[PDB]
Enzyme design. Structure first.
Site, PDB file in Angstrom:
ATOM      1  N   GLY A   1       0.797  -1.208   0.000  1.00  0.00           N
ATOM      2  CA  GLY A   1       0.000   0.000   0.000  1.00  0.00           C
ATOM      3  C   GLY A   1       0.830   1.259   0.000  1.00  0.00           C
TER       4      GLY A   1
ATOM      5  N   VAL B   1      -3.760   3.716   1.753  1.00  0.00           N
ATOM      6  CA  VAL B   1      -4.624   3.037   0.790  1.00  0.00           C
ATOM      7  C   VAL B   1      -3.811   2.105  -0.107  1.00  0.00           C
ATOM      8  CG1 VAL B   1      -6.350   4.863   0.768  1.00  0.00           C
ATOM      9  CG2 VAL B   1      -4.359   5.004  -0.736  1.00  0.00           C
TER      10      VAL B   1
ATOM     11  N   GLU C   1      13.421  -8.329 -38.086  1.00  0.00           N
ATOM     12  CA  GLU C   1      13.215  -9.373 -39.093  1.00  0.00           C
ATOM     13  C   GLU C   1      11.806  -9.258 -39.659  1.00  0.00           C
ATOM     14  OE1 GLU C   1      12.365 -13.433 -37.784  1.00  0.00           O
ATOM     15  OE2 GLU C   1      13.809 -14.179 -39.259  1.00  0.00           O
TER      16      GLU C   1
ATOM     17  N   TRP D   1      19.910 -14.398 -39.715  1.00  0.00           N
ATOM     18  CA  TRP D   1      20.153 -15.053 -40.999  1.00  0.00           C
ATOM     19  C   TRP D   1      21.598 -15.074 -41.493  1.00  0.00           C
ATOM     20  CZ3 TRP D   1      16.158 -17.320 -43.941  1.00  0.00           C
ATOM     21  CH2 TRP D   1      14.861 -17.101 -43.451  1.00  0.00           C
TER      22      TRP D   1
ATOM     23  N   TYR E   1      10.561 -15.588 -47.207  1.00  0.00           N
ATOM     24  CA  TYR E   1       9.434 -14.882 -46.596  1.00  0.00           C
ATOM     25  C   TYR E   1       9.011 -13.562 -47.232  1.00  0.00           C
ATOM     26  CZ  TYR E   1       9.923 -18.260 -42.813  1.00  0.00           C
ATOM     27  OH  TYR E   1       9.982 -19.430 -42.102  1.00  0.00           O
TER      28      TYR E   1
ATOM     29  N   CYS F   1      10.062 -22.291 -42.221  1.00  0.00           N
ATOM     30  CA  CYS F   1       9.544 -23.133 -41.150  1.00  0.00           C
ATOM     31  C   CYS F   1       8.099 -22.763 -40.859  1.00  0.00           C
ATOM     32  CB  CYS F   1      10.385 -22.980 -39.882  1.00  0.00           C
ATOM     33  SG  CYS F   1      11.954 -23.864 -39.962  1.00  0.00           S
TER      34      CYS F   1
ATOM     35  N   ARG G   1       6.027 -26.187 -39.673  1.00  0.00           N
ATOM     36  CA  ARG G   1       6.389 -27.551 -40.063  1.00  0.00           C
ATOM     37  C   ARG G   1       7.519 -28.136 -39.221  1.00  0.00           C
ATOM     38  NH1 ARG G   1      11.180 -27.829 -42.323  1.00  0.00           N
ATOM     39  NH2 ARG G   1      12.125 -25.938 -43.200  1.00  0.00           N
TER      40      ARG G   1
ATOM     41  N   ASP H   1      11.963 -26.022 -33.364  1.00  0.00           N
ATOM     42  CA  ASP H   1      13.047 -26.186 -32.419  1.00  0.00           C
ATOM     43  C   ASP H   1      12.477 -25.655 -31.102  1.00  0.00           C
ATOM     44  OD1 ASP H   1      15.204 -25.916 -30.756  1.00  0.00           O
ATOM     45  OD2 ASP H   1      16.441 -24.778 -32.167  1.00  0.00           O
TER      46      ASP H   1
HETATM   47  N1  NDP Z   1      -2.754  -5.032  -1.591  1.00  0.00           N
HETATM   48  C1  NDP Z   1      -2.957  -5.795  -0.521  1.00  0.00           C
HETATM   49  O1  NDP Z   1      -3.196  -7.044  -0.582  1.00  0.00           O
HETATM   50  C2  NDP Z   1      -2.901  -5.144   0.869  1.00  0.00           C
HETATM   51  C3  NDP Z   1      -2.646  -3.780   1.033  1.00  0.00           C
HETATM   52  N2  NDP Z   1      -2.599  -3.191   2.438  1.00  0.00           N
HETATM   53  C4  NDP Z   1      -2.310  -1.711   2.581  1.00  0.00           C
HETATM   54  O2  NDP Z   1      -1.233  -1.508   3.550  1.00  0.00           O
HETATM   55  C5  NDP Z   1      -1.597  -0.450   4.468  1.00  0.00           C
HETATM   56  C6  NDP Z   1      -1.918  -0.993   5.914  1.00  0.00           C
HETATM   57  O3  NDP Z   1      -0.793  -1.867   6.359  1.00  0.00           O
HETATM   58  P1  NDP Z   1      -0.181  -1.488   7.808  1.00  0.00           P
HETATM   59  O4  NDP Z   1       0.317  -0.073   7.797  1.00  0.00           O
HETATM   60  O5  NDP Z   1       0.913  -2.420   8.137  1.00  0.00           O
HETATM   61  O6  NDP Z   1      -1.288  -1.562   8.961  1.00  0.00           O
HETATM   62  P2  NDP Z   1      -2.130  -2.826   9.450  1.00  0.00           P
HETATM   63  O7  NDP Z   1      -3.361  -2.890   8.658  1.00  0.00           O
HETATM   64  O8  NDP Z   1      -1.340  -4.054   9.398  1.00  0.00           O
HETATM   65  O9  NDP Z   1      -2.576  -2.441  10.906  1.00  0.00           O
HETATM   66  C7  NDP Z   1      -1.535  -2.311  11.912  1.00  0.00           C
HETATM   67  C8  NDP Z   1      -2.341  -1.930  13.160  1.00  0.00           C
HETATM   68  O10 NDP Z   1      -3.367  -2.879  13.512  1.00  0.00           O
HETATM   69  C9  NDP Z   1      -3.373  -3.237  14.899  1.00  0.00           C
HETATM   70  N3  NDP Z   1      -2.616  -4.483  15.116  1.00  0.00           N
HETATM   71  C10 NDP Z   1      -1.789  -5.252  14.326  1.00  0.00           C
HETATM   72  N4  NDP Z   1      -1.335  -6.345  15.034  1.00  0.00           N
HETATM   73  C11 NDP Z   1      -1.879  -6.265  16.257  1.00  0.00           C
HETATM   74  C12 NDP Z   1      -1.807  -7.050  17.379  1.00  0.00           C
HETATM   75  N5  NDP Z   1      -1.071  -8.178  17.422  1.00  0.00           N
HETATM   76  N6  NDP Z   1      -2.504  -6.675  18.479  1.00  0.00           N
HETATM   77  C13 NDP Z   1      -3.275  -5.556  18.533  1.00  0.00           C
HETATM   78  N7  NDP Z   1      -3.372  -4.763  17.463  1.00  0.00           N
HETATM   79  C14 NDP Z   1      -2.677  -5.106  16.311  1.00  0.00           C
HETATM   80  C15 NDP Z   1      -2.712  -2.008  15.522  1.00  0.00           C
HETATM   81  O11 NDP Z   1      -3.516  -0.812  15.342  1.00  0.00           O
HETATM   82  P3  NDP Z   1      -3.626   0.175  16.553  1.00  0.00           P
HETATM   83  O12 NDP Z   1      -2.973   1.470  16.125  1.00  0.00           O
HETATM   84  O13 NDP Z   1      -5.086   0.499  16.777  1.00  0.00           O
HETATM   85  O14 NDP Z   1      -2.936  -0.311  17.804  1.00  0.00           O
HETATM   86  C16 NDP Z   1      -1.605  -1.689  14.512  1.00  0.00           C
HETATM   87  O15 NDP Z   1      -1.070  -0.322  14.538  1.00  0.00           O
HETATM   88  C17 NDP Z   1      -2.752   0.302   3.791  1.00  0.00           C
HETATM   89  O16 NDP Z   1      -2.137   1.306   2.931  1.00  0.00           O
HETATM   90  C18 NDP Z   1      -3.476  -0.788   2.965  1.00  0.00           C
HETATM   91  O17 NDP Z   1      -4.226  -0.262   1.841  1.00  0.00           O
HETATM   92  C19 NDP Z   1      -2.825  -4.083   3.597  1.00  0.00           C
HETATM   93  C20 NDP Z   1      -3.076  -5.402   3.460  1.00  0.00           C
HETATM   94  C21 NDP Z   1      -3.126  -5.998   2.092  1.00  0.00           C
HETATM   95  O1  UMP Z   2      11.782 -19.612 -37.162  1.00  0.00           O
HETATM   96  C1  UMP Z   2      12.320 -20.699 -36.991  1.00  0.00           C
HETATM   97  C2  UMP Z   2      13.337 -21.212 -37.912  1.00  0.00           C
HETATM   98  C3  UMP Z   2      13.907 -22.465 -37.636  1.00  0.00           C
HETATM   99  N1  UMP Z   2      13.546 -23.210 -36.550  1.00  0.00           N
HETATM  100  C4  UMP Z   2      14.285 -24.510 -36.451  1.00  0.00           C
HETATM  101  C5  UMP Z   2      13.548 -25.846 -36.670  1.00  0.00           C
HETATM  102  C6  UMP Z   2      14.652 -26.826 -37.058  1.00  0.00           C
HETATM  103  O2  UMP Z   2      15.265 -27.264 -35.819  1.00  0.00           O
HETATM  104  C7  UMP Z   2      15.699 -26.046 -37.881  1.00  0.00           C
HETATM  105  C8  UMP Z   2      15.386 -26.063 -39.380  1.00  0.00           C
HETATM  106  O3  UMP Z   2      15.639 -27.403 -39.911  1.00  0.00           O
HETATM  107  P1  UMP Z   2      14.841 -28.003 -41.110  1.00  0.00           P
HETATM  108  O4  UMP Z   2      13.491 -28.265 -40.581  1.00  0.00           O
HETATM  109  O5  UMP Z   2      14.802 -27.061 -42.225  1.00  0.00           O
HETATM  110  O6  UMP Z   2      15.459 -29.240 -41.577  1.00  0.00           O
HETATM  111  O7  UMP Z   2      15.442 -24.669 -37.393  1.00  0.00           O
HETATM  112  C9  UMP Z   2      12.563 -22.790 -35.602  1.00  0.00           C
HETATM  113  O8  UMP Z   2      12.204 -23.422 -34.610  1.00  0.00           O
HETATM  114  N2  UMP Z   2      12.003 -21.539 -35.887  1.00  0.00           N
END
Ligand code: NDP
Ligand code: UMP
Ligand code: NDP
Ligand code: UMP
Ligand code: CP6
Ligand code: CP6
Lengths: 547, 542
Positions: free
Chosen positions: A41, A45, A321, A343, A369, A429, A449, A452
């Protein structure tokens, strides 16, 4: 056994954390980890205005109860207290600062037993229906006397701190807000040894930011229609081909996850499926791979940009190419002058000669080609030629079809020009892209055809997701799904050890892609018109660890 | 009485039935139903030599027990009157079992009879005199479940005396000579609850279904609910489609039959499809991106929930292979798949004013054998013109099987406007592993009701053909759907189809002598044991 308080009274913690405004002390090569998401975040947010999806999630979780399960919960608690024996509600506990941040119309929190912790305030200080407690222990006392489903600790930081402190938390429902805001209060750093992530959700976009939900768990300490299931599996193999050569023990984190809904898992699961069930083959002379055939992945571009997070990826190169393709270029020097070496190896004298392109100039990649996208069917000459009005401009055509015939089922971009294949430095190819339009939304399917998995695919997913964004925009549509279809999907043996490591990493919420909104034509994009925002990723990995 | 004997003592029936031959017709029936599979035995023994998978299945079911679930039943049982299962069979049935395999190991063998020397066999081999005497033998033993193994006479009695809770029925999709049959099951008394995957064992396909008598940890459970906090409450088109019409479909617990990959897509499109007045004014429900996978080594995926004909699509396939673009060749074989696309009016509206009637342009066949060549007319000789992709993929499969470039592409961007219509089947990609060939076909536009069923059969057949001329065994046919749609006019027909239970798939047999992709003829293809529900007119418009 010895019941633990958090287990008996089911005390959980739920929070939402964004990234914090850190000071760029000199290196932007930021190191990311779970602690990246800790902003709780600011100024009393939330750090952010409104992220409604998280509010909805928060409400759903803290108000949901299962009455059929209570009878069981009651017995457990009474047994624990040695006291053998109005809709059921959950209890919610919060610090005073948290309580004060809630608007008046929302307090007390609806359908929930509200409990507030405070020292400076007493019940008399509140008009609301709430319980006031001045110490943690009183909550345990309160809980032993109430009928409730589950207990959720809502914060703030001080409150979280002391609860985790006393290990009174069973699980932490953690919302990861993938955006940065000013913060003055933070979530306590989670002890990786006391808490493990067990589930990850899908990724979403809400109020201009992506986010996902993960769950941390506290460290360890008709039935007749169920048998039919066992019968139907009478013919299954007890093990998996390469199991003994891979060893699941290596995927501990990956396998320990209960719910894997993050989109990146579509990629990761394929890697896993290949390692465990892939067939051993020998593609290019010598090199080996583990391969499978036929996979499909789907990414919701309206909710995120699927850039892999389990390893580091840069996109400047693939974007250049892509613009290079759009310009219809086939001149590899253009990329090299921009220090893009994608080539480079396919344009050398030796590489061209081995493709039998003896009369091809170095770095002239041939009708690949770009040429196919803007001139399919034209006769390729060299990379400097002006193919103006030659061949089929597929790109222009699909953009037009998407604008004037959106329901068409023929909107495809194809690079696999059968006639020109042997003239290309190498066959494409990414065979084709097909578009789909519904309710002002554009979806794209791309068929690959050859894939590789370890090196190419990660980039390929990004390339076409960006392309879909570009096409959607110039056609006045919103991007929807990017669908990736994989033909020959392989994992080079040299990539295995590296992918094992990656598979054990947990994805981060995906980033987002922003396109300069003033660009109204597919050809007007430049490198500075692309922005990847909020990319959180793991450490880069060298797929092959050779040295 | 809320529940009776069968439910109390858990009496199940397990059987395997094949199809029966008739001195009237050969192997082609007219009407099919659950009674189609009723062959139990022949001359004291089973109708078939050996079907090891059914044997394995039978063994696994008859011996499986879950001790941690026993007391749950024990309580309810007594509250009425190494853990193992009980198996009951008639004497004639007991007489067929070999010595070395008798008595059925790890099971409590019971023999219902009237003239059996109860003193000629050990006490571990119980014997009863009447059906209603078994209930007595159960009230004294410690068993998990009771399985009735037949024979026919035994099944009949138990079924009439309604002492059967479930029927584990194996459907052997092949015909044999039989003299004994399974009692016709009354649909009003029993309903199919589950259908397994289809398999091939000993040269026959078979599947397993479960008949059910018509009765007419938590930690991660809540987590599941939380992750679904945003999921849509109802399904987009619930009101319009009305899921109550799909009672059978919804009543099925296990739907492992491969045909469900198709049926589930139909269901998904109906329930979640996007309404689109796509083209002609005709409406559709569409979705984007699906994938189906069929194991060609185990069965031929010819839909059984309706009747499908293949001569037409096989001739089209051979026509593609010949590289033809002449619509007349097909019309003269009464294959009218492309007729509408070749009329004067259709071509003119395609702006092909200078195209002869039925000259479809540079479509499939032309691209397959002459990609890149200049299309003139359907009568020209194109020999050695353009790239012969068909010839090339076959050579790649043979000489460079691990290549990741084995593609057959019909979507020639340069020739699109010249075609009667752009191809729906964009491309085929092949994969070869351990002597086995798999194929992926990407379809840009999919008419689930009419097209897809034929499309699946068509490319499954093609996969078999390519595999054979390359001396490979077919593996999987993988179908990728782009714009997948259900025409509104097909909805009622599909509703009917969705409530039909699939039958075990048929098999495809190719003349093994054909070793060149161009030597196949219509007579080289045969579909065997095709069991299906009656044909359906997708557009019920009278
Ligand atoms: N993209 C995603 O998947 C996610 C994004 N986010 C983002 O990250 C940010 C929030 O992360 P973050 O800052 O770490 O805050 P958190 O959401 O992890 O909250 C931390 C707070 O929660 C409480 N807390 C956490 N652990 C405990 C505990 N063991 N006991 C009691 N309270 C606890 C406390 O709040 P208090 O102050 O009340 O004590 C603490 O300050 C935001 O910007 C959010 O949008 C968050 C999760 C997922
Ligand atoms: O765009 C390409 C050109 C060549 N080859 C490979 C396939 C074959 O290993 C070799 C060509 O051998 P012949 O099939 O022509 O015998 O080059 C590819 O995978 N992609
Ligand atoms: N594929 C499959 O799943 C199955 C195939 N089969 C096949 O069918 C054939 C056997 O069926 P079937 O010919 O009908 O013979 P049965 O196995 O059903 O046995 C009939 C005999 O068992 C005893 N019996 C049955 N019911 C009673 C009763 N209510 N009270 C007292 N005794 C009873 C009597 O023997 P007694 O002479 O001593 O009086 C009777 O003559 C075999 O060819 C076998 O291979 C059988 C079951 C399953
Ligand atoms: O083999 C085929 C050929 C056609 N169609 C269907 C798909 C579309 O409903 C229609 C073709 O129309 P367009 O997609 O081209 O507009 O035919 C199939 O499902 N399979
Ligand atoms: C809606 C925000 C939110 N989302 C999640 N995922 N968890 C929380 N604990 C809160 C929350 C933060 C501060 C108060 Cl005061 C109430 C609830
Ligand atoms: C393995 C055959 C088999 N498969 C199934 N699915 N059910 C059965 N009831 C039998 C069976 C037939 C005759 C005797 Cl004697 C014992 C068992």
């Amino acid at each position: 056994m010895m019941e633990q308080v958090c287990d008996v009274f089911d005390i959980y913690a739920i929070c939402a954390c964004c990234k914090v405004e850190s000071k760029n002390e000199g290196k932007k090569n930021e190191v990311f980890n779970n602690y990246t998401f800790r902003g709780l975040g600011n100024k009393g947010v939330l750090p952010w205005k409104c992220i409604s999806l998280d509010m909805k999630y928060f409400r759903a979780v803290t108000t949901y109860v299962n009455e059929s399960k209570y009878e069981k919960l009651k017995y457990k608690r009474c047994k624990y207290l040695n006291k053998e024996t109005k809709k059921l509600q959950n209890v919610v506990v919060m610090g005073r600062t948290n309580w004060e941040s809630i608007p008046k119309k929302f307090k007390p929190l609806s359908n929930r037993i509200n409990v507030i912790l405070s020292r400076t305030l007493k019940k008399e200080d509140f008009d609301e229906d709430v319980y006031i407690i001045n110490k943690v222990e009183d909550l345990i006392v309160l809980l032993g006397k109430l009928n409730y489903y589950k207990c959720f600790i809502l914060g703030g930081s001080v409150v979280y701190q002391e609860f985790l402190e006393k290990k009174l938390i069973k699980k932490i429902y953690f919302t990861r807000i993938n955006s940065t805001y000013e913060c003055d209060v933070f979530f306590p750093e989670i002890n990786e040894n006391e808490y493990q992530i067990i589930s990850v959700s899908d990724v979403y976009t809400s109020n201009n930011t992506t986010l996902d939900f993960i769950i941390y768990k506290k460290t360890n300490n008709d039935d007749e229609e169920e048998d039919d299931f066992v019968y139907f599996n009478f013919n299954k193999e007890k093990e998996e081909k390469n199991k003994n050569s891979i060893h699941p023990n290596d995927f501990q984190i990956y396998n320990s996850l209960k719910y894997k809904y993050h989109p990146e898992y579509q990629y990761l699961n394929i890697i896993y499926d290949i390692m465990m069930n892939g067939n051993k083959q020998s593609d290019r002379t010598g090199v080996g791979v583990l391969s499978k055939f036929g996979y499909i992945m789907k990414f919701d571009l309206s909710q995120y940009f699927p850039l892999l997070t389990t390893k580091k990826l840069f996109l400047r190169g693939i974007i250049e190419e892509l613009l290079w393709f759009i310009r219809g270029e086939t001149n590899g020097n253009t990329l090299l002058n921009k220090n893009v070496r994608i080539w480079e190896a396919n344009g050398t004298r030796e590489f061209l000669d081995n493709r039998k392109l003896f009369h091809r100039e170095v770095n002239d990649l041939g009708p690949i080609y770009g040429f196919q996208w803007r001139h399919f069917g034209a006769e390729y000459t060299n990379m400097y030629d002006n193919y103006e009005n030659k061949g089929v401009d597929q790109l222009k055509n699909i953009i037009n079809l998407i604008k004037n015939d959106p329901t068409s089922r023929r909107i495809l971009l194809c690079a696999w020009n059968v006639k020109d294949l042997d003239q290309m430095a190498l066959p494409p190819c990414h065979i084709l892209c097909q578009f789909y339009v519904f309710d002002g939304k554009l979806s794209c399917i791309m068929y690959q055809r050859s894939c590789d998995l370890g090196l190419g695919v990660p980039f390929n997913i990004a390339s076409y997701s960006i392309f879909t964004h570009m096409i959607a925009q110039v056609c006045n549509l919103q991007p929807a799904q990017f669908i990736h279809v994989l033909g020959n999907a392989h994992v080079y043996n040299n990539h295995i050890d590296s992918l094992k490591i990656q598979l054990n990493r947990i994805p981060y919420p995906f980033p987002t892609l922003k396109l300069n909104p003033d660009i109204k034509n597919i050809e007007d994009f430049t490198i500075s018109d692309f922005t990847i925002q909020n990319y959180v990723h793991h450490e880069k990995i060298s797929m092959d660890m050779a040295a």
